[PDB]
Amino acid sequence: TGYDLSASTFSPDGRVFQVEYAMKAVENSSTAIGIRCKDGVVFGVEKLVLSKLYEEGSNKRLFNVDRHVGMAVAGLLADARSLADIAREEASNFRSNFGYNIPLKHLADRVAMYVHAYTLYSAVRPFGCSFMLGSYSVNDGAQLYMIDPSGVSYGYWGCAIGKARQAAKTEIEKLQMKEMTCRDIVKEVAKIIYIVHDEVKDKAFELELSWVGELTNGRHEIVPKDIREEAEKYAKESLK
Amino acid sequence: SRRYDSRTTIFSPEGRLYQVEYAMEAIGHAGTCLGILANDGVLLAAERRNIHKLLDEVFFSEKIYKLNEDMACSVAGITSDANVLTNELRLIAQRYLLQYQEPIPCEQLVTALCDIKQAYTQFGGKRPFGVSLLYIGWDKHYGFQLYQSDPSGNYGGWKATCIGNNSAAAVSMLKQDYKEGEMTLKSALALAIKVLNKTMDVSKLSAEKVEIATLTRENGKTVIRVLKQKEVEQLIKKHEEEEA
Amino acid sequence: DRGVNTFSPEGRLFQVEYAIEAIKLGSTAIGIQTSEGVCLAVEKRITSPLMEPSSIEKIVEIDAHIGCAMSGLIADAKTLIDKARVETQNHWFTYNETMTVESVTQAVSNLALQFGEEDADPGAMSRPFGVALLFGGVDEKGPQLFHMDPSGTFVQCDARAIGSASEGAQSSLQEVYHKSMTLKEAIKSSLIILKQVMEEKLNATNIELATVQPGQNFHMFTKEELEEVIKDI
Amino acid sequence: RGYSFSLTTFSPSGKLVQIEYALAAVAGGAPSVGIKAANGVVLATEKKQKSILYDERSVHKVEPITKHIGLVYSGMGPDYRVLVHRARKLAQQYYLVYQEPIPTAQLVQRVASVMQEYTQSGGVRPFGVSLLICGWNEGRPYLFQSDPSGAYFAWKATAMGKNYVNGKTFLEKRYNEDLELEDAIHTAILTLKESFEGQMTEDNIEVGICNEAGFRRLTPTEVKDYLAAI
Amino acid sequence: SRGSSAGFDRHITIFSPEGRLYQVEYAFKAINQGGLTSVAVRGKDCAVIVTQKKVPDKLLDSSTVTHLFKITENIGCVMTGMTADSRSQVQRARYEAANWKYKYGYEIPVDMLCKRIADISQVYTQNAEMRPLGCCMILIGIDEEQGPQVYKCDPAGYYCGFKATAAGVKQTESTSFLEKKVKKKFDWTFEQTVETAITCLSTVLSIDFKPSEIEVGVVTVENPKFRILTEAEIDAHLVAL
Amino acid sequence: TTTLAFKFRHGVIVAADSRATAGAYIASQTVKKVIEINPYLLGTMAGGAADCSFWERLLARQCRIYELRNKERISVAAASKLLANMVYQYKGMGLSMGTMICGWDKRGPGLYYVDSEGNRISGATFSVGSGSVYAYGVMDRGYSYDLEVEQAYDLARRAIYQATYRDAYSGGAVNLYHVREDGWIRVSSDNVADLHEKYSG
Amino acid sequence: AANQYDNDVTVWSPQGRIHQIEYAMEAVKQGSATVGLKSKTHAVLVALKRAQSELAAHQKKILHVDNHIGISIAGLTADARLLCNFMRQECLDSRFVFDRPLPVSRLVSLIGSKTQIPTQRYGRRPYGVGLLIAGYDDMGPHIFQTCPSANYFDCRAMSIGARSQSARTYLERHMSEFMECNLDELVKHGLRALRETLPAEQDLTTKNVSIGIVGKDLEFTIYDDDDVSPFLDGLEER
Amino acid sequence: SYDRAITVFSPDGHLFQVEYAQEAVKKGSTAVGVRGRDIVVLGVEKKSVAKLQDERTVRKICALDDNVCMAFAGLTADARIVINRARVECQSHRLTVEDPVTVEYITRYIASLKQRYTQSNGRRPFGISALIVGFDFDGTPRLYQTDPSGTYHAWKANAIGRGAKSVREFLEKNYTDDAIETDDLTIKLVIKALLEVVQSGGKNIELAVMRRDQSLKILNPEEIEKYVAEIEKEK
């Protein structure tokens, strides 16, 4: 009776309810898609601007961590910002400790087992934030990973987390995935974001993009700022 | 979580302690071993577990435990806890020696054990030590003396008090029979086998199903005897004839 | 039940809005800041007459120029009165001067909403301090009294009533004070205690009154001064 | 982290509710016999796995504590392995301070001492393994049993696990005080043979003896040898 | 004293009445969630590994999704539990392998590695305030003395020592097929393992796989390094059926 | 530094000089080397100018906490005792001080002597300081318990006048205190030169 | 039985809700109203102070933390003072170590990581206070609402407190005359934004209104009971 | 390390753990004391009824150092801790100021200690209540009565045992000025006050007196007997 409300207690069919209640707690938050291609990984985050009172970038949802990996986050921005800054401290301890710049698979496994080992105790709650990473070293490939509140981390190509990921996974699947040179897909990211945003009601879809690529050489930039007036010209493909 | 704690260290609305008087009912299930003092030394008189053959040899029994050259203790209630605490209090005895080069007058020891056992019922959220153990001893200050304690924490000089079941067979009858001035320890054995002869289901009260142990002396040093077998077959035929 | 660090379906904490109660329980104290002092009084509610009434400490001098007046759950204040005077002589020690009243009141009210179940070492507090008090003190700014809550909220006050008489005595005190001391605020405040009267006509055995005046340091009133005032009413 | 409140507590009747449940979990365990004999003991037990699929030379139930003291269980699986870990550690504290192999009685003192605080002390449930002890210790062999309460008793024969009333009554019938070597093994084999759930396979039993030269497990070619001599 | 529950029997890892602490079998039912299913092969000279692995949507990177982890240069492992609890368990096994090699010299043999992770899984299911994490570790490996071994610690800590037992989804049909197909040769050499390894999967769940969805990890006595196979050699292994 | 104190049948005189050296160069000719911890007691200082100033400062804090906490005037043996406790538990750390703790209480004139080693003795008279034994000599020639107030003042002025004349590490001024059952008062701020012309040597 | 999500900053409501650190957002909706805003040059803060007593300093809201990074509390007061002793102490620590003004964004981000820890762990209530911090770093004078849900907002012209939504909807439709509008006509434009949260009958008196100014070439300056009297105009009749 | 907050505010300002300690002192012995203006005097309920007691270790009358001594009432084993810590800090207050330690200060230490157990994390505030009697540097035979809420009162009878509301209203009635003499009328008032409740002092009552910072003397069956006799003769 009441097998809920504690992460150290299983269901009678083996399903820790404090994890799947955290999973819907990112399903009631906006989308943030990430598309891999051969020269790097392009992020794009939906924004749901509440009032006019918030200015541009009122809440960052494309954080960066180690001067090359990124942080497209979905759920609670407090929890996502917390694991963002301890990811910063984690790549800090790797670069300080081993000298070599952190390969992303080890960072995703490390933050993954951090947020997993944080779901084994009744003295803590699970995190309420799905998030994804992404970068490439000169010989790494465009590695990106995505991490659930359960703590599982998978390598993807075009993963999408948020509310409208039921819509968003279809267009990324029909987009040609492997062999295009990231500039077009920055442009094409707006087509996904304008399709999956199915409102006009007080959210304004004032999107935001960042990537890592051969135009960046392992960095992050908000776009630079010109595709915001070039990928804005993919209106009427959602209005027709 | 606060849904899970048993909350042992809570006063009742009637003011008492729920986990403490549940230990007092644990004594009445299993418990025997009265103790009688005299002008001479003091004895325990005890009962083993059952008739079950299948028991090879006890060096001392599971009941009477040696503590110093001049002290001993007997145990009621849950036997798993008290073993721990008696080794615990045994440590206390020896470290008094290490602090003072005295054989630890027994009231110091009973006070120390009752303070730590009170500390387990005071805080920490744990269950209290479910044993109302008692003590016999001697010091140069006072005479032969026995003390008796309980899982609540208080104690006393309890000149003929028994513990466990049948408080009336063992002990209200004793407070109509004990001569407080002089007792003459052989007749204290006789009164002990009287009370144990009334508090048993069987008349086979030999050392298969009894455990009596005395404390005496010779020339100053105390002697703790566990009253080996044939002495019990002596005292069991000391009726020959009647006791009540 | 639920714990101490939880918010209530009204809007507040549980233990804080429960700590506003047990202030209605307990004795009543009043204080009036004037332009040349501040007067404090408390009807300390003696139970039996078989006894000694002059050791119920409800007017406690923090320093020579800060006197507090507690009520509610009595003797729960002694840890934070101890922190008040230890912080006071720490201030005079490290800075070689007097204090304000908002520095002692700043320092005590930090300890009010500072508790919890699972925290640092068990010398911390579990329940909040269920004692409302007010520091009558004189400063180089001015005489003033700072009414605390058990919530850590402290406010500037010039006429404040605590205890069970926190509505009728406060509303009576709302209409009778505007001007200055001129010796009669202490006689128009025990008059409010005279309307409050629970057991006895407010003689010099059941009320404790003390003033803090800028010329002197403080004055805990003795018996003949009190019954000198009571004779005038 | 941690709880620091005891989950084992007193019933309103005045008894430990968790410990009788621990003796229930012991009584639902695999049956195991132990026979004290005039020079040495025998501690037999029953290893029935699910299928004929596993390595019967992989896990043991007879396993020594470092010198001449083996201990066999009945009940929970891995809580036993914790008690072997703690027991070996306590025997090596004793060996490094007193420079002799530990007397069996003192090892049962310390194993019963470590099983007591799991009837207390912060959220831990008691072990629910009433393992029994052997040992040659000088002159005459010893045998004990540490219940999940923390009590211990020495005797001449016992059984535990499933249907142990039949083991205690049957060993009460067939025991002699001089009955010493391999005859004890014989009656141990025909105490496990009493139920066994069928056919008495040598890979499903293992025995361990304390024949004045250290506790040692018996090789599977020796149990089947006396299974040929039934 | 059977249904007279002492309160939190199905909440905390404590004893219920009649024994049967109700968390480890609630943790056993956790390893059947989804179900990507391993079977263990034992070779008198080669411990092969088989498991099935299904990609959802051709959007996952199929190389990154696996179970098939490598503990050291001689010990591989595969686990079928909930994959959140998998990598927290395999990282501690790598930790105790490298800690064994730093602390006791030689590289750790396969048995007491599984004893040790079985023992920390025990202290998960002994203390409260932690759940016994639901993944079981089919792990193979060869030492110098004996043959190839295979082990599985459950989420209760009961490692056994198996001839070849794989638990995942459809554990009972698999071990029934292996039991019916090992009594033919109790000596059981079968280095090729072509009629045993994949055919347990293709006879239990009937897919008759293309060489994508199956992961195979061999060790051999002639080459004890743990090797994960690719679609070329597993494709020759499948057309050998 | 050369302090001095002696009790008699009217309270106790505490006198001290006013110079503060720095080895050989001297810092001030006017140093308040008597700490007024309350208007009932006093306390002197005899070396380690931040040590002694800090520990009678902190003694003033602790004794004021005793005044608030137990609503009584502090006994002088309590103040000297707790001073000896704290500077005892900094023994061996290079700490160097020494003082009178005089002052009337409910039993006597007081005058305890507490230093860095933790002596903590009662006394009839003392004079701690750098030279200071000069003061002992001249004070113990003219001391009696049956003195009145004025030649006790002249006994202190001549006493640490000669103790500042002969010693090098002393001088400056002389302040003098006569505490009794009202608290300390101040009776002097004279320097050495006006005493020299006052008494012709 | 009734609400098993009452033992509850560890638990999740089955939809998405953490069920009491949004209820701490209720606990700062209950607090007193305030309004801050920013210009192109200098940002201002304006607060009305509730008098739940005889009369008082009305529980002084806007606080000096800093050396130009000023705050405006709403909600609990002792918890607010704890949080500004934290913010205060490490702002002075950045004065100590780096010897520069601590930038406002890193300030509000690390308190956004300091009030985020009791939201995470067990048996510890969130800091139930809604700060409305405002300061002038190297670029333009920022202003940050942060919240007890540890989710700050780089906003401009925000109002939080009791019925402050009406002050927002005045202040949302009057953003066009920001990035101009100097101090004398800016704070008038903020007081007539505050003068809607009042219960439709009341002057912005000199007693209850305490404001704060921060920006180019001026310290974060508190205007109390006297100094708010040169700011006087309006009717609004509101 | 147990950290559950036990002593918590319920609704209507009621701190239930402390009032449960108030029944826990309502269900004890019947202790009583009289400040008799040159002497102080105690008395509690004899024992029960010794029969097989030891009178040496049935002491509700305890001595702190020499002058102050207390009679607890309730739970009789949580009290002995407070006895021990009272003796320890009492020796520490002989270490610092070196006085015949004043009774006010040690009863402030007891009340501050029990109030510190109404605050800490999970330790059940005591179920005792004291009668701190004694003297000081100048006579002044002050009596004090503490409380499980840590509130001490300097009253003059304070019968705070189990059937002692009748005793304190009796002592309200019958203590004005007739007990200002040396010992006899005071001790007669105490043994009259406890003979209101139970029965003869040959089995029940025991007392203790304290005179001017010397001779804490208990009264063997003799004292009690005499007291009872006198009381009966007067009544």
UniProtKB/Swiss-Prot annotation, chain B:
One Pfam family named in its UniProt record: Proteasome
A GO CC annotation given for this chain: extracellular exosome
Main location: cytoplasm
PROSITE patterns found in the cross-reference section: PROTEASOME_ALPHA_1, PROTEASOME_ALPHA_2
Modified sites of kind Phosphoserine: S12, S74, S172
N6-acetyllysine: residues bearing it: K126, K175
Protein keywords: Acetylation, Cytoplasm, Host-virus interaction, Nucleus, Phosphoprotein, Proteasome
Keyword set includes Acetylation: yes
A GO biological process held by the record: proteasome-mediated ubiquitin-dependent protein catabolic process
Localization of this protein: Cytoplasm; Nucleus
InterPro entries attached to this UniProt entry: Ntn_hydrolases_N (IPR029055), Proteasome_alpha (IPR050115), Proteasome_alpha-type (IPR023332), Proteasome_asu_N (IPR000426), Proteasome_bsu_CS (IPR016050), Proteasome_sua/b (IPR001353)
SUPFAM superfamilies listed in its UniProt record: N-terminal nucleophile aminohydrolases (Ntn hydrolases)
CDD domains linked to this entry: proteasome_alpha_type_4 (cd03752)
Induction trigger: Down-regulated by antioxidants BO-653 and probucol.
Subunit and interaction comment: The 26S proteasome consists of a 20S proteasome core and two 19S regulatory subunits. The 20S proteasome core is a barrel-shaped complex made of 28 subunits that are arranged in four stacked rings. The two outer rings are each formed by seven alpha subunits, and the two inner rings are formed by seven beta subunits. The proteolytic activity is exerted by three beta-subunits PSMB5, PSMB6 and PSMB7.
Stated family: Belongs to the peptidase T1A family.
Entry protein name: Proteasome subunit alpha type-4
Name of the coding gene: PSMA4
Curated annotation (Swiss-Prot), chain C:
Distribution of this protein across tissues and organs: Expressed in fetal brain (at protein level).
GO BP: proteasome-mediated ubiquitin-dependent protein catabolic process
NCBIfam families: PRK03996.1
Subunit structure: The 26S proteasome consists of a 20S proteasome core and two 19S regulatory subunits. The 20S proteasome core is a barrel-shaped complex made of 28 subunits that are arranged in four stacked rings. The two outer rings are each formed by seven alpha subunits, and the two inner rings are formed by seven beta subunits. The proteolytic activity is exerted by three beta-subunits PSMB5, PSMB6 and PSMB7. PSMA5 interacts directly with the PSMG1-PSMG2 heterodimer which promotes 20S proteasome assembly.
Modified residues (Phosphoserine): S8, S48, S55
Residues with Phosphothreonine modification: T47
Broad class of the protein's primary localization: cytoplasm
Name assigned to this protein: Proteasome subunit alpha type-5
Classification via Gene3D superfamilies: Glutamine Phosphoribosylpyrophosphate, subunit 1, domain 1
Keyword Nucleus: yes
Keyword terms of this UniProt record: Acetylation, Cytoplasm, Glycoprotein, Nucleus, Phosphoprotein, Proteasome
Function statement: Component of the 20S core proteasome complex involved in the proteolytic degradation of most intracellular proteins. This complex plays numerous essential roles within the cell by associating with different regulatory particles. Associated with two 19S regulatory particles, forms the 26S proteasome and thus participates in the ATP-dependent degradation of ubiquitinated proteins.
Localization, UniProt: Cytoplasm; Nucleus
Annotated family: Belongs to the peptidase T1A family.
Glycosylation sites (chain numbering): S190
Swiss-Prot record, chain F:
Organism encoding this protein: Homo sapiens
Enzyme superclass (EC): hydrolase
Key word Chloroplast present: no
Record note on quaternary structure: The 26S proteasome consists of a 20S proteasome core and two 19S regulatory subunits. The 20S proteasome core is a barrel-shaped complex made of 28 subunits that are arranged in four stacked rings. The two outer rings are each formed by seven alpha subunits, and the two inner rings are formed by seven beta subunits. The proteolytic activity is exerted by three beta-subunits PSMB5, PSMB6 and PSMB7. Directly interacts with POMP. Interacts with ABCB1 and TAP1. (Microbial infection) Interacts with HIV-1 TAT protein.
Function: Component of the 20S core proteasome complex involved in the proteolytic degradation of most intracellular proteins. This complex plays numerous essential roles within the cell by associating with different regulatory particles. Associated with two 19S regulatory particles, forms the 26S proteasome and thus participates in the ATP-dependent degradation of ubiquitinated proteins.
Molecular function GO terms recorded: endopeptidase activity; peptidase activity; threonine-type endopeptidase activity
A single Gene Ontology CC term: centrosome
Family membership: Belongs to the peptidase T1B family.
Cleavable signal peptide: none
The keyword Hydrolase is annotated on this UniProt entry: yes
Residues reported to bind bortezomib: A49
Entry's EC annotation: 3.4.25.1
Entry's Gene Ontology BP terms: proteasome assembly; proteasome-mediated ubiquitin-dependent protein catabolic process; proteolysis; response to oxidative stress
Residue positions of the active site: T1
Annotated localization: Cytoplasm; Nucleus
Whole-protein coverage range: 60 to 260 of 263
Swiss-Prot record, chain G:
Disulfide bond entries: none
Induction or repression: Induced in breast cancer tissue (at protein level). Up-regulated in liver tumor tissues.
Subcellular location as annotated: Cytoplasm; Nucleus
Chain positions with Phosphoserine modification: S109, S176
Source organism of the structure: Homo sapiens (Human)
Keywords per UniProt: Acetylation, Cytoplasm, Glycoprotein, Immunity, Isopeptide bond, Nucleus, Phosphoprotein, Proteasome, Ubl conjugation
GO CC, any one term: nucleoplasm
Sugar-bearing residue positions: S109
Chief place where the protein resides: cytoplasm
This protein's name: Proteasome subunit alpha type-1
A Pfam family annotated for this UniProt entry: Proteasome
GO biological process: immune system process; negative regulation of inflammatory response to antigenic stimulus; proteasome-mediated ubiquitin-dependent protein catabolic process
